[PDB]
Design a protein around this motif. Structure first.
Motif, PDB file in Angstrom:
ATOM      1  N   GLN A 288       0.899  -1.152   0.000  1.00  0.00           N
ATOM      2  CA  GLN A 288       0.000   0.000   0.000  1.00  0.00           C
ATOM      3  C   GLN A 288       0.928   1.189   0.000  1.00  0.00           C
ATOM      4  OE1 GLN A 288      -2.409   0.908   3.432  1.00  0.00           O
ATOM      5  NE2 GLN A 288      -3.980   1.589   1.988  1.00  0.00           N
TER       6      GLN A 288
ATOM      7  N   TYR B  29       1.686  -6.009   3.326  1.00  0.00           N
ATOM      8  CA  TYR B  29       0.722  -6.795   4.107  1.00  0.00           C
ATOM      9  C   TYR B  29       0.747  -8.191   3.486  1.00  0.00           C
ATOM     10  CZ  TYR B  29      -1.442  -2.508   5.785  1.00  0.00           C
ATOM     11  OH  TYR B  29      -1.660  -1.270   6.372  1.00  0.00           O
TER      12      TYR B  29
ATOM     13  N   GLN C 144      -1.449 -11.873   3.276  1.00  0.00           N
ATOM     14  CA  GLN C 144      -2.817 -12.254   3.630  1.00  0.00           C
ATOM     15  C   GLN C 144      -2.922 -13.717   3.260  1.00  0.00           C
ATOM     16  OE1 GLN C 144      -6.057 -10.492   1.354  1.00  0.00           O
ATOM     17  NE2 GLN C 144      -7.621 -11.357   2.665  1.00  0.00           N
TER      18      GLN C 144
ATOM     19  N   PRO D  18     -12.062 -17.182   6.933  1.00  0.00           N
ATOM     20  CA  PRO D  18     -11.996 -15.860   6.326  1.00  0.00           C
ATOM     21  C   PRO D  18     -10.599 -15.587   5.941  1.00  0.00           C
ATOM     22  CG  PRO D  18     -12.198 -15.780   8.792  1.00  0.00           C
ATOM     23  CD  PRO D  18     -11.970 -17.229   8.383  1.00  0.00           C
ATOM     24  N   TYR D  19     -10.405 -14.730   4.988  1.00  0.00           N
ATOM     25  CA  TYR D  19      -9.049 -14.405   4.630  1.00  0.00           C
ATOM     26  C   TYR D  19      -8.695 -13.254   5.554  1.00  0.00           C
ATOM     27  CZ  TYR D  19     -11.442 -16.876   1.035  1.00  0.00           C
ATOM     28  OH  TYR D  19     -12.239 -17.745   0.340  1.00  0.00           O
ATOM     29  N   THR D  20      -7.556 -13.360   6.198  1.00  0.00           N
ATOM     30  CA  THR D  20      -7.157 -12.366   7.183  1.00  0.00           C
ATOM     31  C   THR D  20      -5.744 -12.001   6.730  1.00  0.00           C
ATOM     32  OG1 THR D  20      -8.429 -13.600   8.923  1.00  0.00           O
ATOM     33  CG2 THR D  20      -6.668 -12.104   9.744  1.00  0.00           C
ATOM     34  N   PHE D  21      -5.395 -10.747   7.107  1.00  0.00           N
ATOM     35  CA  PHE D  21      -4.239 -10.017   6.606  1.00  0.00           C
ATOM     36  C   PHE D  21      -3.275  -9.903   7.792  1.00  0.00           C
ATOM     37  CE2 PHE D  21      -7.192  -8.025   3.558  1.00  0.00           C
ATOM     38  CZ  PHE D  21      -6.376  -7.767   2.527  1.00  0.00           C
ATOM     39  N   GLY D  22      -2.013  -9.661   7.458  1.00  0.00           N
ATOM     40  CA  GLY D  22      -1.011  -9.504   8.507  1.00  0.00           C
ATOM     41  C   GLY D  22      -1.058  -8.046   8.924  1.00  0.00           C
ATOM     42  N   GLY D  23      -0.494  -7.743  10.103  1.00  0.00           N
ATOM     43  CA  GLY D  23      -0.592  -6.381  10.635  1.00  0.00           C
ATOM     44  C   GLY D  23       0.184  -5.312   9.864  1.00  0.00           C
TER      45      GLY D  23
ATOM     46  N   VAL E 179     -13.283  -5.033   2.288  1.00  0.00           N
ATOM     47  CA  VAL E 179     -12.180  -5.019   3.235  1.00  0.00           C
ATOM     48  C   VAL E 179     -12.024  -3.606   3.750  1.00  0.00           C
ATOM     49  CG1 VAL E 179      -9.661  -5.101   3.406  1.00  0.00           C
ATOM     50  CG2 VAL E 179     -10.743  -6.669   2.017  1.00  0.00           C
TER      51      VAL E 179
ATOM     52  N   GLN F 299      -9.923  -0.486   6.179  1.00  0.00           N
ATOM     53  CA  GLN F 299      -8.634  -0.089   6.741  1.00  0.00           C
ATOM     54  C   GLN F 299      -8.916   1.018   7.758  1.00  0.00           C
ATOM     55  OE1 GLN F 299      -5.652   1.615   4.138  1.00  0.00           O
ATOM     56  NE2 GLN F 299      -4.111   0.594   5.387  1.00  0.00           N
TER      57      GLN F 299
ATOM     58  N   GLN G 250      -4.258   2.330  10.286  1.00  0.00           N
ATOM     59  CA  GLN G 250      -3.694   1.612   9.148  1.00  0.00           C
ATOM     60  C   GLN G 250      -3.907   0.091   9.151  1.00  0.00           C
ATOM     61  OE1 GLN G 250      -0.141   4.919   8.129  1.00  0.00           O
ATOM     62  NE2 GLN G 250       0.243   2.741   8.236  1.00  0.00           N
ATOM     63  N   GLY G 251      -4.685  -0.443  10.091  1.00  0.00           N
ATOM     64  CA  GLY G 251      -4.835  -1.903  10.121  1.00  0.00           C
ATOM     65  C   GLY G 251      -5.898  -2.343   9.114  1.00  0.00           C
ATOM     66  N   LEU G 252      -5.671  -3.481   8.454  1.00  0.00           N
ATOM     67  CA  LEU G 252      -6.631  -3.932   7.434  1.00  0.00           C
ATOM     68  C   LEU G 252      -7.509  -5.051   7.978  1.00  0.00           C
ATOM     69  CD1 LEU G 252      -4.275  -3.968   4.356  1.00  0.00           C
ATOM     70  CD2 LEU G 252      -6.470  -2.792   4.571  1.00  0.00           C
TER      71      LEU G 252
ATOM     72  N   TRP H 182     -10.852  -7.922   7.169  1.00  0.00           N
ATOM     73  CA  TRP H 182     -11.815  -8.520   6.242  1.00  0.00           C
ATOM     74  C   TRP H 182     -13.200  -8.317   6.836  1.00  0.00           C
ATOM     75  CZ3 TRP H 182     -14.294 -13.401   7.509  1.00  0.00           C
ATOM     76  CH2 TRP H 182     -15.127 -13.876   6.564  1.00  0.00           C
TER      77      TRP H 182
ATOM     78  N   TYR I 160     -13.190  -0.712   1.213  1.00  0.00           N
ATOM     79  CA  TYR I 160     -12.844  -1.056  -0.158  1.00  0.00           C
ATOM     80  C   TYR I 160     -13.535  -2.373  -0.530  1.00  0.00           C
ATOM     81  CZ  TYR I 160      -8.543   1.618   0.871  1.00  0.00           C
ATOM     82  OH  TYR I 160      -7.654   2.606   1.297  1.00  0.00           O
TER      83      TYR I 160
END
Lengths: 107, 111
Positions: free
Chosen positions: A36, A85, A87, A93-98, B30, B32, B36-38, B40, B88
């Protein structure tokens, strides 16, 4: 879920960098990496663990086994600063890293 | 679109207009957060309306779509302060993993 280390990553232009993620269960090779850039939406770099996304330069590569996956940038260029990030895409669920913020070390 | 300021408990419906493709296999919401944390939020398979959400919004948000008008919807209800964030939507290509960008955002603020 996911754990991303390190949080901050100061690196000099030309340097190599590695950002890794770990998961709680086995997720085969189902894992992608997003960049990002500041002031923009995230964008895809690698998906399917190692497969490079359309348009991404080969300085980025992905790898990993079982739970731990790593993104590597061989020669860091100026455009690569921003927050990365990981993921998982193994099952919902698909989850993302911090996130790991890459900052360019300059004079 | 559909964002803005809303008081805790309010409701809101976000939209997502797609073009480029006539349909994606999975559209995702999704968010944010300001730190800044993302996260789902949800995923729906249009044309059968199946849905899946984390506990976080389970029972309050409701994703949906219109394969005809090319629209993705998120209907947030009983908004909490923690829903404040940029929202988003993205498509998940078939042999692709996580969900791939095309939204420019839309900031919801619960206060």
């Amino acid at each position: 879920l996911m754990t991303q280390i390190p949080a901050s990553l100061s690196a000099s232009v030309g340097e190599t960098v590695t950002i890794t993620c770990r998961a709680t269960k086995n997720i085969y090779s189902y894992l992608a990496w997003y960049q990002q850039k500041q002031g923009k939406s995230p964008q895809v770099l690698v998906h399917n663990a190692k497969t490079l996304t359309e348009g991404v330069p080969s300085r980025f590569s992905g790898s990993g086994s079982g739970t731990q996956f790593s993104l590597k940038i061989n020669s860091l260029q100026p455009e690569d600063f921003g927050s990365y990030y990981c993921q998982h895409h193994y099952a919902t669920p698909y989850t993302f890293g911090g996130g790991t913020k890459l900052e360019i070390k300059r004079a | 679109s559909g964002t803005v300021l809303a008081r805790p408990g309010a409701s809101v419906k976000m939209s997502c207009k797609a073009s480029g493709y006539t349909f994606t296999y999975w559209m995702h919401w999704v968010k944010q957060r300001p730190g800044q944390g993302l996260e789902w939020i949800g995923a729906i398979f249009p044309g059968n309306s199946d849905s899946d959400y984390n506990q976080k919004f389970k029972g309050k948000a409701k994703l949906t779509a219109v394969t005809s008008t090319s629209n993705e919807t998120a209907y947030m209800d009983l908004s909490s302060l923690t829903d404040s964030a940029v929202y988003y939507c993205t498509r998940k290509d078939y042999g692709t993993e996580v969900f791939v960008y095309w939204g420019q955002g839309t900031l919801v603020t619960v206060s």
